[PDB]
Write a protein that binds this ligand. Sequence first.
Ligand SMILES: C[As](C)(=O)[O-]
Ligand SMILES: [Fe+3]
Ligand SMILES: [Fe+3]
Length: 253
Amino acid sequence: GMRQGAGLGYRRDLAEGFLQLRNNDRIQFMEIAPENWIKMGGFARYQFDKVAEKIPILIHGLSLSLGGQAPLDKELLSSIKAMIKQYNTPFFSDHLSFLLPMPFTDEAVKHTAARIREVQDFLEIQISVENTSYYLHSETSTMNEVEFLNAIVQEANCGIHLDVNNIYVNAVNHGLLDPHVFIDNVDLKRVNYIHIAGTVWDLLEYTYARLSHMPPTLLERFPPFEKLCKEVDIIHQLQQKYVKKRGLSWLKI
Ligand SMILES: C[As](C)(=O)[O-]
Ligand SMILES: [Fe+3]
Ligand SMILES: [Fe+3]
């Protein structure tokens, strides 16, 4: 325990800056993918484990493919459960995929929701689903992106890991959903984790003005460590502006 506030993602090449952090007052938590942890060497893992003595961890995975057709990877799920136990961190988020369009249909909602309920049963925790950029919008879609997300997470009864940039990117690429309409309609009571990497900064403020609580917010990004820490201080200063002005509580994971 315990994750709250503003954090930074772990990379083997930032290990020297992470290992010099004397506490988690500034970098309040870090993020790691299981796909990278699993394939760490002995010394890379040592450095990581040594940083995890001071800086708590959230697990955000790349490859579980929650809306995919291939059966769920039990070898991967087992490493996720092992990490949750090892680092004492009862959180997990991943993505829907990764050519073809991602159709926002009820058939895909029911399919994805059902797999998320299986992942939840195995891990014995509730997971969060991250909104991602998609390349091709399906002609067959019966709903828009925020409807789709909302529907999946309400039918799986899981959280939302909200990525601000991915909202902006789907608005730029497709022109289908105003990022302001997105945030106004997202099930914000379910957002327990946020990612941010100008107009996008303002979408963070727009979200912060509307959430029910203040979740952990990670700077997602190759610049030098202390620059990355100054960017994290700004996310945090922005969090405190909104916790103060709106009387919010900090969500602690
Ligand atoms: C780096 As992403 C598209 O999973 O927020
Ligand atoms: Fe992601
Ligand atoms: Fe992200």
